[PDB]
Design a protein around this ligand. Structure first.
Ligand SMILES: *[C@@H]1O[C@H](CO)[C@@H](O)[C@H](O)[C@H]1NC(C)=O
Ligand SMILES: *[C@@H]1O[C@H](CO)[C@@H](O)[C@H](O)[C@H]1NC(C)=O
Ligand SMILES: *[C@@H]1O[C@H](CO)[C@@H](O)[C@H](O)[C@H]1NC(C)=O
Ligand SMILES: *[C@@H]1O[C@H](CO)[C@@H](O)[C@H](O)[C@H]1NC(C)=O
Ligand SMILES: *[C@@H]1O[C@H](CO)[C@@H](O)[C@H](O)[C@H]1NC(C)=O
Ligand SMILES: *[C@@H]1O[C@H](CO)[C@@H](O)[C@H](O)[C@H]1NC(C)=O
Ligand SMILES: *[C@@H]1O[C@H](CO)[C@@H](O)[C@H](O)[C@H]1NC(C)=O
Ligand SMILES: *[C@@H]1O[C@H](CO)[C@@H](O)[C@H](O)[C@H]1NC(C)=O
Ligand SMILES: *[C@@H]1O[C@H](CO)[C@@H](O)[C@H](O)[C@H]1NC(C)=O
Lengths: 197, 346, 235, 46
């Protein structure tokens, strides 16, 4: 579950552990303790031994710092992503798919984890389907009849105009249905009535 | 001097509105890199050319080499993650229905081709052939590398130096199957399968709802169905022609491949630098010098080559971050665009 | 040098003896006593890689030899050629070749399952049944055929309310290093020699301070988007 | 702990400016507003 923060912590700890362990490395030099080098060699050669050791250790610090720069850049990308997620989904309702949850989005709740943030995207998912016979327009009186908002479906014999994301049939009336043109150009136009209130 | 563009004078008038009276569908491509090539470097065959004393001397330089290997492994697994999260969003591989009559729209250019042994649509075949990819993980038995070959010389030299590439986890056929599942679902179901399984819907109805989602009612779709179908078909054919004509259409992917090839090949050239040593061959250094000076030169050369490897790794890390940003962008595009309809301009 | 010697078909000009390549390594040589032009090629090699279920579960294991074919891999027994002390695998009967390289210790299965230990080029191993390691091409999923028709729609009659977590990192630990004490603790001569390298320590100090303040800004701009703290009502 | 050991050799770990109680208070404010106000409190008042 929490792998995406556990890895942050473990990578930081591992980098520091490697940086510490580098102290024992010799880098070709006779030993990795400077006092022994000073108290066992003459200054001219103690000089070069220390030179090599300093170069190695400084280069180790340098690579540590560069790796940290790159990790910080990637974490800043994730922090910009988290800021956008909190703004767009905690403080609103997002309209872009798969940004704030698999499915249609309703809300979101933040929870503060150590070195991170956790969101609880409360989404909406349709479950149970039922096939139907659908027709783009209904030619009542020669004129076509597009559904004002919804799809045309037929439970076999009768036609209803339901919404698209939750089956809920209503009888056809002039308020579900707007008209534009005539039933001579569109294909799949059908013949039905449109009750007038 | 650079011309920004043809000067124009848009006309303002507080009782003048220009309402268009005719549209024009248009299909326009958009290339994106997703995954680079998974390299992996052998520390002690590059740094320490097939020698014995040198390797022992390397054994006292700390954990530089295991750290390098660990970083490159992280990059490789990251690349496989990128590919898997961009393409394999669909849980269950759908497949196209036998009939291909989608209200008049012609998908033959994008839907798969049963004739070819490579089960890819013609457009995929075109851009595929266009991208001149260098070898990425053949078997390369000792025999194919041994010889006086000419074109394979580059990969052979890289392998001889120990530098090598690893095959991507998902073969190109599995990638093709993923893209075909995305296509079949988005054709017969629409955006509906981004919120669960795929809900079937006749394609003209889906285009009617796409239309209704940009402020134009649906009658300008149902009343002009054949005209829009012809515009769509022509547009797709044009895309095919335009891709075929200019080889620079997809220069981004070629840029990725070439950047990797250059980056790794510089590495092979780096070994021809003495670094202030007697020569660039360890064996000669060991075979002409006494241990005291020999070791000193060996330390000088090992530090040089370890520094070169460190630079290579670092720049690989940077480039992998850029590719991961592009792959996150492509994952967001395949979500908000392929699996839905986007309201974000441009 | 070491390697394998080959009858080079190439022709040297009468005065130069041996060739080279991109890296200045020798790639040919005119053999004395025979005046024959000889090639050089490194003895075949390649990384190995181990495929193990968790030790808590099993102790048997399969080994992947990357790149190499399944011909020289068994021939290379540990006694002479195979450097690692892995003698049983150099003789196993379960040798199977994939595009990644010769692997030993798994039985190829003609089935297909969603897998856990990726190998490469489609193959990926696992543990299954009298129970050992398999190696099979992965399965993308249950190949479905969604029913298209040009007059049939599917309208959902029932919903559900998922709630799915999503975990994002925000900040990292704000380390900081002490250059001189790290490199050499309390050695005044070493400090003298160390100051001679210029602005390295200052540069590291500056970079790490930049990272730390960036962390503080990260947390501040991720969480502190609220004008004033609010209270939940009593009821 | 190992932290003391790595503390020597001069590798300090500075604390984060925001303590976990402060961060928890931030998220508590967010939750209370988003529960009794909705989206309204991203735009000006609550
Ligand atoms: C809808 O038709 C398809 C066509 O085969 C069928 O598989 C499916 O079961 C039908 N829907 C229902 C709810 O039965
Ligand atoms: C369809 O809906 C109508 C609504 O009046 C109902 O009377 C009828 O029983 C339903 N089923 C069929 C098969 O017509
Ligand atoms: C629909 O009705 C019109 C007249 O009302 C008739 O001319 C036409 O043939 C009918 N078509 C169908 C498909 O019922
Ligand atoms: C719209 O433009 C197209 C050009 O492709 C033309 O064929 C068509 O007749 C135009 N329609 C109208 C109503 O002008
Ligand atoms: C679709 O386009 C292809 C390529 O030209 C060809 O089969 C034909 O022109 C079209 N066929 C159908 C059925 O649309
Ligand atoms: C070395 O011995 C071979 C034996 O056949 C002979 O051909 C060759 O000339 C000899 N080389 C020299 C330099 O004498
Ligand atoms: C492995 O070597 C044999 C040698 O006869 C060859 O036939 C085979 O093709 C090689 N493997 C591959 C995958 O090519
Ligand atoms: C649906 O597809 C069938 C088979 O291609 C076709 O005969 C029929 O005309 C299509 N729908 C319409 C327009 O009635
Ligand atoms: C809808 O689904 C719920 C479970 O999500 C179930 O309890 C209920 O009986 C189903 N039918 C209706 C009409 O709500």
């Amino acid at each position: 579950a929490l792998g995406k923060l556990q890895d942050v912590v473990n990578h930081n700890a591992q980098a520091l552990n490697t940086l510490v362990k580098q102290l024992s490395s010799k880098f070709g030099a006779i030993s990795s303790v400077l006092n022994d080098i000073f108290s066992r060699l003459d200054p001219p050669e103690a000089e070069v031994q220390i030179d090599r050791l300093i170069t190695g250790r400084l280069q180790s610090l340098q690579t540590y710092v560069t790796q940290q720069l790159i990790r910080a850049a990637e974490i800043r990308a994730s922090a910009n992503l988290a800021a956008t997620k909190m703004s767009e989904c905690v403080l609103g309702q997002s309209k872009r798919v798969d940004f704030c949850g698999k499915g249609y989005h309703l809300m979101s709740f933040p929870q503060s984890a150590p070195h991170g943030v956790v969101f609880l995207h409360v989404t909406y998912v349709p479950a149970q389907e039922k096939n139907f016979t659908t027709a783009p327009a209904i030619c009542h009186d020669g004129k076509a009849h597009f559904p004002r908002e919804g799809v045309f479906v037929s439970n076999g014999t009768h036609w209803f105009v339901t919404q698209r994301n939750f089956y809920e049939p209503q009888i056809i009336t002039t308020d579900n249905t707007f008209v534009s043109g005539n039933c001579d150009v569109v294909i799949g136009i059908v013949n039905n009535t449109v009750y007038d209130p | 001097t650079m011309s920004l563009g043809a000067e124009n004078s848009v006309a303002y008038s507080n009782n003048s509105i220009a309402i268009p009276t005719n549209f024009t569908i248009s299909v326009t491509t958009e290339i994106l890199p997703v995954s680079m090539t998974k390299t992996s470097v052998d520390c002690t065959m590059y740094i320490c050319g097939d020698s014995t004393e040198c390797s022992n001397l390397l054994l006292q330089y700390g954990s530089f080499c295991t750290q390098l290997k660990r970083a490159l492994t992280g990059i490789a697994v990251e690349q496989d993650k990128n590919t898997q999260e961009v393409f394999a969003q669909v849980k269950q591989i759908y497949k196209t229905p036998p009939i291909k009559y989608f209200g008049g729209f012609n998908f033959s250019q994008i839907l798969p081709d049963p004739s070819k042994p490579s089960k890819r649509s013609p457009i995929e075949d075109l851009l595929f052939n266009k991208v001149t990819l260098a070898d990425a993980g053949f078997i390369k038995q000792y025999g194919d590398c041994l010889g006086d070959i000419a074109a394979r010389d580059l990969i052979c030299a890289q392998k001889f130096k120990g530098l090598t590439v690893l095959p991507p986890l998902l073969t190109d056929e599995m990638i093709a199957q993923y893209t075909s599942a995305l296509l079949a679902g988005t054709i017969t179901s629409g955006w509906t399968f981004g919120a669960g399984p795929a809900l079937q819907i006749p394609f003209p109805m889906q285009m009617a709802y796409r239309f209704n989602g940009i402020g134009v009612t649906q009658n300008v779709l149902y009343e002009n169905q054949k005209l829009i179908a012809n515009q769509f078909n022509s547009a797709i054919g044009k895309i095919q022609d335009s891709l075929s004509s200019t080889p620079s259409a997809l220069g981004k992917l070629q840029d990725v491949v070439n950047h990797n090839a250059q980056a790794l090949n510089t590495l092979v050239k780096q070994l021809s630098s003495k670094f202030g040593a007697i020569s660039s061959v360890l064996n000669d250094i060991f075979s002409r010098l006494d241990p005291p000076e020999a070791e000193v030169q060996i330390d000088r050369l090992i530090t040089g080559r370890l520094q070169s490897l460190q630079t290579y790794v670092t720049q690989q890390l940077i480039r992998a971050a850029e590719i991961r940003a592009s792959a996150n962008l492509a994952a967001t595009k395949m979500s908000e665009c392929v699996l839905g309809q986007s309201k974000r301009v441009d | 040098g070491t390697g394998v010697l080959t009858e080079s078909n190439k022709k040297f000009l009468p005065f130069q003896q041996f060739g080279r390549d991109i890296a200045d390594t020798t790639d040919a040589v005119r053999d004395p006593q025979t005046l024959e032009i000889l090639d050089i090629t490194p003895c075949s090699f390649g990384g190995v890689s181990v495929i193990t279920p968790g030790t808590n579960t099993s102790n048997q294991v399969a080994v992947l030899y990357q790149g190499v074919n399944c011909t020289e891999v068994p021939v290379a027994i540990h006694a002479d050629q195979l450097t690692p002390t892995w003698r049983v695998y150099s003789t196993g009967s379960n040798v199977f070749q994939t595009r990644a390289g010769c692997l030993i210790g798994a039985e190829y299965v003609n089935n297909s399952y969603e897998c856990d230990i990726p190998i490469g080029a489609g193959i990926c191993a696992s543990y299954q049944t009298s129970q050992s390691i398999i190696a099979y091409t992965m399965s993308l999923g249950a190949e479905n055929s969604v029913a298209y028709s040009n007059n049939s729609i599917a309208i959902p009659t029932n919903f559900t309310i998922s709630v799915t977590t999503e975990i994002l990192p925000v900040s990292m630990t704000k380390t900081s290093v002490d250059c001189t004490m790290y490199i050499c603790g309390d050695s005044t001569e070493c400090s003298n020699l160390l100051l001679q390298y210029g602005s390295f320590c200052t540069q590291l100090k500056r970079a790490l301070t930049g990272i730390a303040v960036e962390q503080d800004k990260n947390t501040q701009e991720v969480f502190a988007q609220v004008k004033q703290i609010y209270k939940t009502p009593p009821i």
